[PDB]
Write an enzyme that holds these catalytic residues in place. Structure first.
Site, mmCIF file in Angstrom:
data_model
loop_
_atom_site.group_PDB
_atom_site.id
_atom_site.type_symbol
_atom_site.label_atom_id
_atom_site.label_comp_id
_atom_site.label_asym_id
_atom_site.label_seq_id
_atom_site.Cartn_x
_atom_site.Cartn_y
_atom_site.Cartn_z
ATOM 1 N N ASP A 105 -3.839 -13.944 -1.327
ATOM 2 C CA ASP A 105 -3.462 -14.177 0.065
ATOM 3 C C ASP A 105 -4.681 -14.141 0.972
ATOM 4 O O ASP A 105 -4.823 -14.981 1.869
ATOM 5 C CB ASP A 105 -2.439 -13.140 0.535
ATOM 6 C CG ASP A 105 -1.106 -13.259 -0.168
ATOM 7 O OD1 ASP A 105 -0.844 -14.301 -0.805
ATOM 8 O OD2 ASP A 105 -0.311 -12.295 -0.077
ATOM 9 N N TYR A 107 0.825 -1.202 0.000
ATOM 10 C CA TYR A 107 0.000 0.000 0.000
ATOM 11 C C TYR A 107 0.862 1.255 0.000
ATOM 12 O O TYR A 107 0.524 2.241 -0.667
ATOM 13 C CB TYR A 107 -0.947 -0.014 1.199
ATOM 14 C CG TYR A 107 -1.947 -1.132 1.139
ATOM 15 C CD1 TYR A 107 -2.205 -1.923 2.250
ATOM 16 C CD2 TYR A 107 -2.631 -1.404 -0.038
ATOM 17 C CE1 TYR A 107 -3.116 -2.958 2.187
ATOM 18 C CE2 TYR A 107 -3.546 -2.428 -0.108
ATOM 19 C CZ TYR A 107 -3.785 -3.202 1.002
ATOM 20 O OH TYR A 107 -4.698 -4.222 0.920
#
Ligand SMILES: [Fe+3]
Ligand SMILES: [Fe+3]
Ligand SMILES: [Fe+3]
Ligand SMILES: [Fe+3]
EC number: 1.17.4.1
Lengths: 339, 339
Positions: free
Chosen positions: A237, A122
């Site tokens: 994930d 991010y």
């Protein structure tokens, strides 16, 4: 009571998942629940670095987005960052002290590690699309709409850990603390654990997939493609993460792990259902904020709210809860290409 | 007092390493101490799986070893497994609750994750050399010589965490618990942290490199080469681990992070020195157990004890302590090929 290496030679195959004798030797030749072993192996096999994804093209897209489409993308990206900031640290500080089997102990730690890669990705995106990253990160703490979901999600973690401390230090029974009445109960402590796992299951299985849809909606228009490529890896994930909390909940609920958990899982089935409901509505209200200044091709307040109900039903069915919405089909089937 | 997401908008660049406001947003565009960022990057760049190393040849070597050489190798391998079993979980349960800067929080979690790979590699080796792995893992808990080092090392962790709980729940001052006198002190709590880090520095920088030398001694004779190839990867990771605890100790000692730490680091310099001494002697006594039934080409009780003093001096100098042994040269220079 807690020890980083319990000196008793216990049969780790007969220990419960939680609240048993803490794990001493870390061995991987045998598993009580082999699901956690293969989650470790799958997650290790998926290891990826944020920097191997070229996000350099996403700065031009972002500057070309109209102001409201900027607001949609940045507000969604900030929520993802808040979410995995909590998921970076919380599984270790909250679940690890309670685990009594080695395969689960390692998965919780591998799970939390994968979340740090998500958090770093991010930052990688933010650095490459805006001029001043500080403005983005600072709004995450001081966003009125973001603080709402932030303090609610963390409470399931904090209340568990604070009660963990009272139990490791005192044990069951009623105690006196500076004259105050403190009654530590094992059933009440594991009540706070089951609810916590329910909350974390909604976080990863429902809240995050709302954000995936918002991120891939840009990808469908061929915008923010570097960002989307990363979210593809995050999403793969996340599927392992929700699967782990799914088995943890089902095993405790079935009474096979802890028979005492079976009775507690039924006694709190109402507040588990109500928790998933509030989470779904919170995500709906969030869509009003995302599309506050307008919508974009392929995604608006209406379409996203349909995906909330659609995914919420699925996730609740997998944890044995009743469905709260109409059983309908997928409103954004293009998202399956990205998953 | 502890929160998995502190709601205050703080400048994470001015927060101390420990005991400050817990980290909320996980950002990686800025670092107070950029060393922890590059330790994250180096450790991520070193990612390896135990299974990519062929240990299949080590079963023939092990069965060919005479009984005492078996005892040397198995006793060394069991100690490594005990050590990284504690290092698998302890950095997360013990340090993470106290960290107040994001770069350190992630390194502690990446550090602990790398230790689970180390733990899994020890299982991989054990599975491939012995017929019944259960005998090995069970002796780790019930070995009189192993329990000595086990309960001593964990105490530095456990005493820190148990006092962490009293502080997050009560804060400073004297409190009453069922009539008992409990006096929680911030200086006393951070006293237990500095000592803990000193202990962990000796574990990774001194105790483990004693085992590396024992493992590579077999490699020098061209035996247990699969095992040695794995230890090469473990050793390269261990160098980052001790480096991290080195900077943590030096920064706290220098008073630049916490000026209050500077005064405490001097006040406990004696017990830090004494801790490293006891650890060195414990490793010497361990060599008497390793070579209890005999020695092998390239390594005996005498040669290993020289490497204990040799490496102990180096590590203590890097943390600003005085040297406890004669300043001598490397007694086993062949080990540098493996490092
Ligand atoms: Fe994540
Ligand atoms: Fe996740
Ligand atoms: Fe290690
Ligand atoms: Fe290490």
């Amino acid at each position: 009571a807690y020890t980083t290496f319990s000196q008793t030679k216990n049969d780790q195959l007969k220990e419960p998942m939680f609240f048993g004798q803490p794990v001493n030797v870390a061995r991987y030749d045998q598993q009580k629940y082999d699901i956690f072993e293969k989650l470790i192996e799958k997650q290790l096999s998926f290891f990826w670095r944020p920097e191997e994804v070229d996000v350099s093209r996403d700065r031009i897209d972002y500057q070309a987005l109209p102001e409201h489409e900027k607001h949609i993308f940045i507000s969604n990206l900030k929520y993802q960052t808040l979410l995995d900031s909590i998921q970076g640290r919380s599984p270790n500080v909250a679940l690890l002290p309670l685990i009594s089997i080695p395969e689960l102990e390692t998965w919780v730690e591998t799970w939390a590690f994968s979340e740090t890669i998500h958090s770093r990705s991010y930052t990688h995106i933010i650095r490459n699309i805006v001029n001043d990253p500080s403005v983005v990160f600072d709004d995450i703490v001081t966003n009125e709409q973001i603080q709402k979901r932030a303090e609610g999600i963390s409470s399931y973690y904090d209340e568990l850990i604070e009660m963990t401390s009272y139990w490791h230090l005192l044990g069951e029974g009623t105690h006196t603390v500076n004259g105050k009445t403190v009654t530590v109960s094992l059933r009440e402590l594991k009540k706070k654990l089951y609810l916590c796992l329910m909350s974390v299951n909604a976080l990863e299985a429902i809240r995050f997939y709302v954000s995936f849809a918002c991120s891939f909606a840009f990808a469908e228009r061929e915008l923010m493609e570097g960002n989307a490529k990363i979210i593809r890896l995050i999403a793969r994930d996340e599927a392992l993460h929700l699967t782990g909390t799914q088995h943890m909940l089902n095993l405790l609920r079935s009474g096979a792990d802890d028979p005492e958990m079976a009775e507690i899982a039924e006694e709190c089935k109402q507040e588990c259902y109500d928790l998933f409901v509030q989470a779904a509505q919170q995500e709906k209200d969030w869509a009003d904020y995302l599309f506050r200044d307008g919508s974009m091709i392929g995604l608006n307040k209406d379409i996203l709210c349909q995906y909330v109900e659609y995914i919420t039903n699925i996730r609740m069915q997998a944890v044995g809860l009743d469905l709260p919405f109409q059983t309908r089909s997928n409103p954004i089937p293009w998202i399956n290409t990205w998953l």
